[PDB]
Structure formats: structure tokens, C-alpha cells
Amino acid sequence: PSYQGYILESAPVGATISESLNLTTPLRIVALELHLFLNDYTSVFTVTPTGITRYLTLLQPVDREEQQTYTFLITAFDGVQESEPVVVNIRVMDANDNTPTFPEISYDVYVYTDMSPGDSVIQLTAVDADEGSNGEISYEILVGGKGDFVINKTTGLVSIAPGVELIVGQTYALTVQASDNAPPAERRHSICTVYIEVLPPNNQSPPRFPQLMYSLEVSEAMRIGAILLNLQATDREGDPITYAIENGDPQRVFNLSETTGILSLGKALDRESTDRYILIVTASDGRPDGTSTATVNIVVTDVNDNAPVFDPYLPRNLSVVEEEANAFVGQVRATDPDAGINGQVHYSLGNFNNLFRITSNGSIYTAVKLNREARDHYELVVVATDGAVHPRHSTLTLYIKVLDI
Ligand SMILES: [Ca+2]
Ligand SMILES: [Ca+2]
Ligand SMILES: [Ca+2]
Ligand SMILES: [Ca+2]
Ligand SMILES: [Ca+2]
Ligand SMILES: [Ca+2]
Ligand SMILES: [K+]
């Protein structure tokens, strides 16, 4: 048979003895009316005179400066029967005098994106001077960590929450609370405010490009030294920026300024040959980690810089019958290295245009019954014309010899 009670040293006369340390619930003795008598301390504690369940009460106020631990014996009596004795033990627990209080009301602290989950943010420590458990401090983060931060219930260290990977330029206002492990009704707490901002690693970044890829058009005709493109990379921290081409131009046909980032042209372009460059460019602090990249797609565009050339080995000596019209003389063929309208060839005749004609393709014909005796030798000149505005020509004299039978 064994009872354990608890009473607070500030408790009034006429107070029930409790069962938990929490002091929320009262002590509960069974009466199996009957007479429960108690042997010691009868001047401070009294039993409930009636009821199946019975309570202990304060007669005189207690104080634990002397006498923190009463132990005595309930027994029930009835004349007929004296009971076996029940042991009651009580503890007079100390009042909560002190609020756990932080040194500072607020805290300012930085966080860097490179720091992982579990990496520590800020140790902070309230101090509750009350001896025992009226000063065992517990720390909770109430709100405003967005669950990216978590504190240690007992140590007071805020570290990074599981699997977060913090984004830059992100602020926070955590509100932490220190509370003592005292009983509920007599328990103190104080709150505190951690303002957090997220920086980049080492508070440093590379110089960034306003875009990752650049889609250019250039005319093969564009001058040497004429600027293609300014590569305006801003650096957050104000570091000086060094640009350089890294891939895509083994010829140094292009010149990117080391300091200004302007990309001029260094050698003459020809599209006939190579019609597209794709460089890689870089801007950087110097700081080993601090460096960005970017890809620039030069596509060179066409100008009519090429006359249509006749195929070298065309038969030049031709023959057509004595006397006929729409009679096939022979065929020519010309090509143009340019592109578009500048590539298209159109065939024309530079003389004898009432005698002979020519089709859209190379096919030369007679328009009229040619006369074997009036004429035998025609040095005729055929003209290939490219299809541009401001077109270019080539000519080719053929030697037609008209026949008979
Ligand atoms: Ca006290
Ligand atoms: Ca306290
Ligand atoms: Ca920088
Ligand atoms: Ca060219
Ligand atoms: Ca052309
Ligand atoms: Ca061209
Ligand atoms: K104290």
C-alpha cells in the first residue's frame, strides 16, 4: 500500500494535495462511513471525512525551506477492525520565481545557399536562474521558419531542416520560445525573434549573362571591326569582369573585348565556305568558383557576291538541221554559289533573238526555219542571269553550224 502526493510551497490553506508533478489532478485515496486516521503531521494535513474516494487537504501552509518531504501512515479504524497501514509520501515542490529570458530580443543572422541540412544557423540560450526543474529550459520555434529551420528542444541551436536547399534573397522571421519545465499553472516563458537572410556562397556569385544562348544573323559582307554583339554581364558583388571566347572559333575570326564585352569581327566572312559559327563565351570574377558561360550562334547570311558560272566543259560546238523551227540546238547549264534569289539562274540570248530562242532551263531552240545557204556559221552568245535585285551576268559564246541533207 503506497501513495505519492505533491503540493506547491505557495499553495493556500484549503488546497487539495495532487498526484502528478503537474499539480493539475488531486491525490485519490480509497475508502473500501469509515474512519481513515493518520498517525503523523495531523496538524498540517486532513482527510476528507466522507466519500468512497478521499482527498488530503492543507490545514497550515507549507514551505520547503524546512520540510520538503512529509511521510506518514493512513489507517482505517472501525472499533471492530483496525486496517493494515497505508503509506502516504508528499513532496513540497519549489515555486517558480524566474522567467527564462534571452540575452537579446532579436537576432540578425546570415545563411548561405551552400550549407546543407543539419548545418547550424544560430545558437541561442535563454537563462532561467531557478534551481531544479523550474529552470530546465525547453526551446520551440513557434512560427516563421516556414519549416526550413528547426531548433533543438534542449540545447537551443537552430539548424537547417531536413532536405531544404535554401533559395537566395529569402528572408525569414523565426520566433523562438523558451519555457521552463515547471508545472502548467505556475510556468513562465519568453519569446524571441531571429531574422534570417539567405546569401549566395561566400556572399559571392559569378557575373551573369542576361541570356544563356544568343541567336545572331551576320551578313558575310559585314566589315572587319564592325560590332556583332555586346555581352553585358553584370556582377552582383561589383567584381571586375573578364570576357573571353573559349570554343567555337579556332580561327579568331571574332574578337570579344577582354574588358568591354563587345564582340567585333576580326577576319572577313564568306558564307560560300562556312556558314555558321557557335562560340562559347565566359565572364568571371577571378574567384576560382566565380565563372559563367554562354553560347552564341552566329549564322552568316547571304549577299550576291557570285556571278553565275557556266559549267566549264559544256559542248560549245553545236549543230541544228537545214531548215526548221522549234529544232533542238543544244543545252547549257550554269550555277550560282550564292543562295536564294541570288542563287537562281535565268537564261537569256544576247543576239539573234528573232532566229533562236531559249527556255527557262538550258534548252536553246530555233524560233524560225533557219536557212542553210543564207547563213551557215552563227557565233551566238547565251547569257546566264542570277535572280537578285542588281543581278550579275555571265556570257558564253556558242558556235552553231547549221546543216543539210
Ligand atoms: Ca521558492
Ligand atoms: Ca523558472
Ligand atoms: Ca561576383
Ligand atoms: Ca562570299
Ligand atoms: Ca549570284
Ligand atoms: Ca553569297
Ligand atoms: K529560487
Swiss-Prot record:
Domain (Cadherin) ranges: 1-102, 103-209, 210-310, 312-405
Tissue expr: Expressed in brain and sensory epithelium of the developing inner ear. Expressed in the retina, in the photoreceptor inner segments, the outer plexiform layer, the inner nuclei layer and the ganglion cell layer and, more diffusely in the inner plexiform layer (at protein level). Not detected in the retinal pigment epithelium (at protein level). Expressed in the spleen, dorsal root ganglion, dorsal aspect of neural tube, floor plate and ependymal cells adjacent to the neural canal.
Intracellular or extracellular location(s): Cell membrane
Residues forming coiled coils: none
Residues bearing glycans: N22, N152, N255, N317, N361
Disease affiliated with this protein: Defects in Pcdh15 are the cause of the Ames waltzer (av) phenotype. It is characterized by deafness and a balance disorder, associated with the degeneration of inner ear neuroepithelia.
Domain statement: Cadherin repeats 1 and 2 mediate calcium-dependent heterophilic interaction with CDH23. Three calcium ions are usually bound at the interface of each cadherin domain and rigidify the connections, imparting a strong curvature to the full-length ectodomain.
Quaternary structure and partners: Antiparallel heterodimer with CDH23. Found in a complex with TMIE and LHFPL5. Interacts with LHFPL5/TMHS; this interaction is required for efficient localization to hair bundles. Interacts with MYO7A. Interacts with USH1G; this interaction may recruit USH1G to the plasma membrane. Interacts with TOMT. Isoforms CD1 and CD3 interact with TMC1 (via N-terminus) and TMC2 (via N-terminus). Interacts with PIEZO1.
Function: Calcium-dependent cell-adhesion protein. Required for inner ear neuroepithelial cell elaboration and cochlear function. Probably involved in the maintenance of normal retinal function.
Official protein name in the record: Protocadherin-15
Originating species: Mus musculus
Gene: Pcdh15
